[PDB]
Write an enzyme that holds these catalytic residues in place. Structure first.
Site, PDB file in Angstrom:
ATOM      1  N   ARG A  89       0.822  -1.213   0.000  1.00  0.00           N
ATOM      2  CA  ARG A  89       0.000   0.000   0.000  1.00  0.00           C
ATOM      3  C   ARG A  89       0.831   1.227   0.000  1.00  0.00           C
ATOM      4  O   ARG A  89       0.467   2.215  -0.612  1.00  0.00           O
ATOM      5  CB  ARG A  89      -1.044  -0.009   1.118  1.00  0.00           C
ATOM      6  CG  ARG A  89      -2.227  -0.963   0.765  1.00  0.00           C
ATOM      7  CD  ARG A  89      -3.286  -1.199   1.883  1.00  0.00           C
ATOM      8  NE  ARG A  89      -3.531  -0.026   2.720  1.00  0.00           N
ATOM      9  CZ  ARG A  89      -4.727   0.457   3.065  1.00  0.00           C
ATOM     10  NH1 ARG A  89      -5.859  -0.030   2.560  1.00  0.00           N
ATOM     11  NH2 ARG A  89      -4.759   1.471   3.904  1.00  0.00           N
ATOM     12  N   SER A  90       1.945   1.214   0.729  1.00  0.00           N
ATOM     13  CA  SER A  90       2.814   2.386   0.725  1.00  0.00           C
ATOM     14  C   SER A  90       3.295   2.730  -0.636  1.00  0.00           C
ATOM     15  O   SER A  90       3.470   3.943  -0.974  1.00  0.00           O
ATOM     16  CB  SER A  90       4.039   2.159   1.678  1.00  0.00           C
ATOM     17  OG  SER A  90       3.511   2.157   2.974  1.00  0.00           O
ATOM     18  N   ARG A 129       1.044  12.918  -9.308  1.00  0.00           N
ATOM     19  CA  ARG A 129       0.799  14.361  -9.131  1.00  0.00           C
ATOM     20  C   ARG A 129       2.020  15.227  -9.397  1.00  0.00           C
ATOM     21  O   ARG A 129       1.878  16.275 -10.001  1.00  0.00           O
ATOM     22  CB  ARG A 129       0.191  14.675  -7.769  1.00  0.00           C
ATOM     23  CG  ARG A 129      -0.515  16.050  -7.701  1.00  0.00           C
ATOM     24  CD  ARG A 129      -2.045  15.938  -7.401  1.00  0.00           C
ATOM     25  NE  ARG A 129      -2.683  15.386  -8.526  1.00  0.00           N
ATOM     26  CZ  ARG A 129      -3.825  14.758  -8.588  1.00  0.00           C
ATOM     27  NH1 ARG A 129      -4.634  14.620  -7.575  1.00  0.00           N
ATOM     28  NH2 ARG A 129      -4.147  14.273  -9.759  1.00  0.00           N
ATOM     29  N   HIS A 138       2.023  15.606 -13.052  1.00  0.00           N
ATOM     30  CA  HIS A 138       0.989  16.580 -13.362  1.00  0.00           C
ATOM     31  C   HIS A 138       1.438  18.049 -13.278  1.00  0.00           C
ATOM     32  O   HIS A 138       0.971  18.908 -14.044  1.00  0.00           O
ATOM     33  CB  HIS A 138      -0.260  16.344 -12.496  1.00  0.00           C
ATOM     34  CG  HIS A 138      -1.027  15.107 -12.872  1.00  0.00           C
ATOM     35  ND1 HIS A 138      -1.937  14.518 -12.029  1.00  0.00           N
ATOM     36  CD2 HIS A 138      -0.990  14.335 -13.993  1.00  0.00           C
ATOM     37  CE1 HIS A 138      -2.453  13.451 -12.625  1.00  0.00           C
ATOM     38  NE2 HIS A 138      -1.906  13.325 -13.825  1.00  0.00           N
ATOM     39  N   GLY A 162       7.061   2.153   6.768  1.00  0.00           N
ATOM     40  CA  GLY A 162       6.760   2.162   8.195  1.00  0.00           C
ATOM     41  C   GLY A 162       7.908   1.668   9.059  1.00  0.00           C
ATOM     42  O   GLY A 162       8.431   2.399   9.914  1.00  0.00           O
ATOM     43  N   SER A 163       8.269   0.415   8.852  1.00  0.00           N
ATOM     44  CA  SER A 163       9.288  -0.216   9.616  1.00  0.00           C
ATOM     45  C   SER A 163      10.708   0.215   9.262  1.00  0.00           C
ATOM     46  O   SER A 163      11.655   0.100  10.077  1.00  0.00           O
ATOM     47  CB  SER A 163       9.207  -1.738   9.383  1.00  0.00           C
ATOM     48  OG  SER A 163       9.552  -2.059   8.027  1.00  0.00           O
ATOM     49  N   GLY A 164      10.861   0.632   8.023  1.00  0.00           N
ATOM     50  CA  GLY A 164      12.156   0.953   7.457  1.00  0.00           C
ATOM     51  C   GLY A 164      13.024  -0.267   7.311  1.00  0.00           C
ATOM     52  O   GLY A 164      14.209  -0.147   7.219  1.00  0.00           O
ATOM     53  N   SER A 193      -2.245   0.610   8.195  1.00  0.00           N
ATOM     54  CA  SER A 193      -3.259   1.432   7.539  1.00  0.00           C
ATOM     55  C   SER A 193      -3.135   2.910   7.886  1.00  0.00           C
ATOM     56  O   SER A 193      -3.151   3.757   6.988  1.00  0.00           O
ATOM     57  CB  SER A 193      -4.680   1.009   7.890  1.00  0.00           C
ATOM     58  OG  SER A 193      -4.963  -0.289   7.450  1.00  0.00           O
ATOM     59  N   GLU A 205      -0.148   4.471   6.171  1.00  0.00           N
ATOM     60  CA  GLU A 205      -0.344   4.585   4.686  1.00  0.00           C
ATOM     61  C   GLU A 205      -1.207   5.756   4.356  1.00  0.00           C
ATOM     62  O   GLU A 205      -0.941   6.506   3.410  1.00  0.00           O
ATOM     63  CB  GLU A 205      -0.903   3.265   4.146  1.00  0.00           C
ATOM     64  CG  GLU A 205       0.168   2.175   4.255  1.00  0.00           C
ATOM     65  CD  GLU A 205      -0.394   0.798   4.535  1.00  0.00           C
ATOM     66  OE1 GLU A 205       0.395  -0.125   4.741  1.00  0.00           O
ATOM     67  OE2 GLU A 205      -1.637   0.643   4.556  1.00  0.00           O
ATOM     68  N   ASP A 252       0.165  14.594  -0.435  1.00  0.00           N
ATOM     69  CA  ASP A 252      -0.739  15.585  -0.999  1.00  0.00           C
ATOM     70  C   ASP A 252      -0.532  16.987  -0.440  1.00  0.00           C
ATOM     71  O   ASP A 252      -0.799  17.979  -1.131  1.00  0.00           O
ATOM     72  CB  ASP A 252      -2.196  15.137  -0.962  1.00  0.00           C
ATOM     73  CG  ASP A 252      -2.472  14.046  -2.022  1.00  0.00           C
ATOM     74  OD1 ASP A 252      -3.427  13.303  -1.869  1.00  0.00           O
ATOM     75  OD2 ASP A 252      -1.743  13.900  -3.048  1.00  0.00           O
TER      76      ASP A 252
END
Lengths: 181, 181, 183, 183
Positions: free
Chosen positions: C47-48, C58, C61, C88-90, C150, C153, C161
């Site tokens: 997910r990351s 973006r 863009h 997360g964990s690296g 979650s 992420e 953003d």
């Protein structure tokens, strides 16, 4: 200097000369592993990775529990599942890792590589040796194109062998293909 | 003119104001469809497509038979399976096609879109209406960023609801995650 | 037990905590680096990785020369280029490799992670520390009701953003005519 | 029934037939177009799509501004750009859309297909006809023992790799320093 279509013939001739150096004891074993494993994972980097995906797709079409290493929805491997790694060099770090992890989980590793004493080859339970070592083999193609083409054709022959074993024919084979596009 | 971290707060404030306009009757129904369907497909274009994938992945982690429309190994849909389409415009041609094909196969279509009278909305069996119509809703973000963020959070809330229904907790939930990398 | 819309509220509640934790000083350096580096590469796994793709899109863009590590068409990194790694964990093995390889090529590595002393964090030129350490847990601060990574992420997406906004601010960018038009 | 290595031989046997069928005149125009167009986009669905990615990758390796329709980072097509579409049937709905959209933007469309009168073939500026028509079948010519469009996909790969060679010939390109180095 030559026609595009003439280059196609030269490729086919490299492929024909090259493929005709592949050993069959190992190949027929790969089919047999595919037939007995509950899950099959394929793997590769770059263009070899594309050929892996092409092989996994056709495996899925035929009803096998087939997956590709590194995709979003790839499930965990369990004991006894098969991992099929296509690697020319046999030295790609990510693929070395996949093989080691598979082995730690008691998966079975098949490697299609040029060098059987490579990092990936030494981890494999089954090796399908591909042509192109310093001993042999001509190619006027960019770096790894011939190996990648050979991978595709070899995968598609294993498909034929699986069809044979299952008593399937091309004209009437039921395929589990995507139907939403 | 402001700090990066301050922009994070402005986004969270757009998200908070925006998400607090989503209706719950439709949402709880989506969970219920996910619970009863043998296969679940998600779908989206561009960044919405990324959020779809993120949702399918977590569905797979929880043990659901989850897939993403348009991927190499996507299996056929069968009667009664669910297709979850995230589309701001509700007008993306490919997604219009996916919905129509699903419907022709007697799949169930859920659409998360701004405009329920859109092409995709009119095909849907279930609509989760997202904020952002000409009526309402502020955003200083590029074209579709707020909708896409809202999609993610909404998907991840449906995950929480599924966890609740299944009596699962975050600290101890078994997840079916990839183990070869 | 709770309405789906109530879970949205909870998720938002957790993201607010995560935002207050983020050091703006490092965040601001990130945007500076994006503006100066000739090429920008994003990376992550799972997910990351999806959030890294969302950010790269973006950046494209906006007219930046943006790429995603591991894709078919990814070009080579050259000295001074930026690589942005969300983990997360690296400790994800592929990403450790990407970070160490970038550094060896004299790329600049920005890591967004919970653990600055992780394998990836130790390779990073710039670290954007996210909440969720065993410390912030045992000491009362961090709590998630969500699975796995979650919340992390989600924070990644929102942080990326926000960086877009800072970039748009810094520039004059709407002029998103860099959007795909085929298919 | 047959050794796996014997099936390789059969597959090769089928590809030889397919090569003799291909009109070089259209093939040669393709390379000319690749050399003149500022951007090149490849496309296909499923396995054909994998072969389109394989070709785009090698075009990038040669220093062409190459892209794959449908990917996260795909840029807009501008007038005069080339789109290369591989489709057996020439009826895949997404690809019909891509071809018609490219044409409407005044892109040049090259279709590699079995059916020149297909929906995709009718949009194409240039058609590279591959074997396998109901005609070549009933009339003795075309035969495959392979499933689905396997022979076609194989032919695509080989045809695209042949086009690479013609491009290398035409140019001075080895100088594949355009290969990824991260991860």
């Amino acid at each position: 200097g030559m026609k595009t279509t003439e280059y196609v013939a030269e490729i086919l001739n490299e492929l024909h000369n090259s493929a005709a150096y592949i050993s069959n004891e190992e190949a027929d074993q790969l089919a047999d592993h595919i037939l007995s494993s509950h899950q099959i994972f394929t793997a590769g980097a770059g263009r070899s990775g594309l050929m892996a995906k092409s092989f996994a797709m056709r495996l899925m079409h035929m009803g096998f529990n087939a997956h590709i290493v590194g995709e979003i929805l790839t499930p965990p491997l369990a004991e006894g599942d098969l991992v099929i790694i296509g690697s020319g060099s046999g030295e790609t770090k990510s693929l070395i890792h996949t093989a080691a992890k598979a082995k730690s989980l008691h998966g079975i590793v098949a490697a299609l590589t040029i060098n059987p004493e490579s990092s990936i080859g030494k981890q494999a339970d089954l090796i399908i040796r591909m042509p192109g070592s310093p001993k042999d083999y001509k190619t006027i193609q960019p770096m790894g194109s011939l190996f990648e083409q050979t991978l595709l054709l070899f995968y598609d022959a294993v498909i034929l062998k699986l069809m044979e074993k299952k008593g399937l024919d091309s004209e009437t084979m039921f395929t589990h293909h995507a139907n939403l596009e």
